[PDB]
Amino acid sequence: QTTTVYSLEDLLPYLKQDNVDVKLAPGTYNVNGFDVGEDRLFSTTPLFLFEGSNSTYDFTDVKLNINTVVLTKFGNNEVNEIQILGNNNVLKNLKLEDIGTTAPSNRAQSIVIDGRDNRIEGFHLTIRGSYPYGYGDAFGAGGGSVINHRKHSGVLIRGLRNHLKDCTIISRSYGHIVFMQAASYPTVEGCYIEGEMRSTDDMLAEEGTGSPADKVDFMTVWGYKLPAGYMMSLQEGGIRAYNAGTTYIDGVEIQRATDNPTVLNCTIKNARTGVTLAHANGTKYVEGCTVLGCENGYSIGSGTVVNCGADAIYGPVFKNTYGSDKGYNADITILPPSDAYYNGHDAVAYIGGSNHNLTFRSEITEIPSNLKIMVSGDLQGLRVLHGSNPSQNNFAGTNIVLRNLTNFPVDLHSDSSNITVTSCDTDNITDNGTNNSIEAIDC
């Protein structure tokens, strides 16, 4: 009792219905500007609004191309390609691609998951169309921007017990790739998440062209001219949780923080951060992940990161978010470089807050001269130089267990205290803190 349909026009009615089992015939389906409007197939945004419950949709060998001009076809309103509002739905195997480079009139999300107990599996997403594209967040990702933005993010997970599984999410757009707002018990599992990078030196080479960055003389939102020597993502977070948001379950509007997020066996590459769950409440659990060439590896604030790896070519594998972080437990492998080193942060980890149990493993024997494990101190972080974002730099660290099973050096700043350090070698450890103990071990 599986119904097969052969066009987007024949598909749309089933999106309103409960308990359906629908298949969209293999093929390549184009949505264009001429397809959006009053008499046209799509008169409202979101384009594909899944309102029914207990339904399954098969998109095997479906290619769905959406021209980015569609993001300008609904006025000054947010545009979403896919939004799920019902419960207990399963969508599988869709290949979806944004065509062109037109930015939203307002902003856009490819996929938004409200409701409860939904699952998207096997999707292959390619996200395009945003402004500005090519600077990451250097000229603004929020209010008071130097260059006003019209962002386009990938998958927004909200709702309750919603599940993103075995998907591939490629972003070539300024926005988060996967993020969570007001999501309770979200799970991201088995996914490949990929952005692209650009050095600040390359951006600075736009001088004299009349580019948007040139017209503001490269003055960042952080308060200083864009510094040379860093690698940025052109995207925002790889997997990022927010401590607020709006979601809709059973028609009821809800405003709440993300809580109890789980991330399992994902690979994140070339994003501003691999996994950042520090703003979520509840239990944060990250296991089996691989983060390559991100500006920041893991920042969950408090919780567990276990059996995870990250390389350190563009930024630290580990960072505490604020000086108030408490109970971050982590076992992170520093992986072999996935590309040439270009790390202006001068750190493999920045540690502060209290009551952390931290283990770093690595087989690296060629240690770049600028890379070290920092407990407290003045991080040379791209966004925290010269007193900017001061709550995210220069904080104290106390009552922390640090197992340095690597050849990287450790610098314990004067603001650190009661740090118990276990290291392969103790000769490359600087201790300027109070009541810290340094004990060597074999291997």
Author numbering: 1 to 443
The paper states:
FdlA from Flavobacterium sp. SA-0082 is an endo-type fucoidan-degrading enzyme that cleaves the sulfated fuco-glucuronomannan (SFGM) through a lytic mechanism. We show that the FdlA-NTD adopts a right-handed parallel β-helix fold, and possesses a substrate binding site composed of a long groove and a unique alkaline pocket. Our structural, biochemical, and enzymological analyses strongly suggest that FdlA-NTD utilizes catalytic residues different from other β-helix polysaccharide lyases, potentially representing a novel polysaccharide lyase family. Here, we report crystal structures and enzymological characterization of wild type (WT) and eight single mutants of the catalytic N-terminal domain (NTD) of FdlA, revealing its unique substrate binding pocket and identifying the key catalytic residues.
We first measured the enzymatic activity of 12 mutants and found that eight of them (D137A, K141A, H176A, F179A, E236A, R240A, Y242A, and Y242F) almost completely abolished their activities, H279A mutant retained approximately 65% of the activity compared with WT, while mutations of Asn243, Arg272, and Tyr322 to Ala only negligibly affect their activities. Brønsted base is responsible for proton extraction from C-5 atom in β-elimination reaction. Two positively charged residues Lys141 and Arg240 have their side chains pointing closely to the C-5 atom at the +1 subsite, hence are potential candidates for a catalytic base. Our structures showed that the K141A mutant possesses an active site almost identical to the WT, similar to the Y242F mutant. In contrast, Lys141 possibly functions as a catalytic base by capturing a proton from the C-5 atom at +1 subsite. Subsequently, abstraction of the proton occurs on C-5, a process that is presumably accomplished by Lys141, leading to the formation of an enolate intermediate. While it remains considerably challenging to unambiguously identify residues responsible for proton abstraction and transfer without structures of FdlA-NTD in complex with substrates or products, we were able to infer from our crystal structures and docking models that Tyr242 and Lys141 serve as the potential Brønsted acid and base, respectively. We found that the inactive FdlA-NTD mutants exhibited similar Kd values as the wild-type form. These binding assay data clearly demonstrated that while our inactive mutants lost their catalytic activity, they maintained their substrate binding ability.
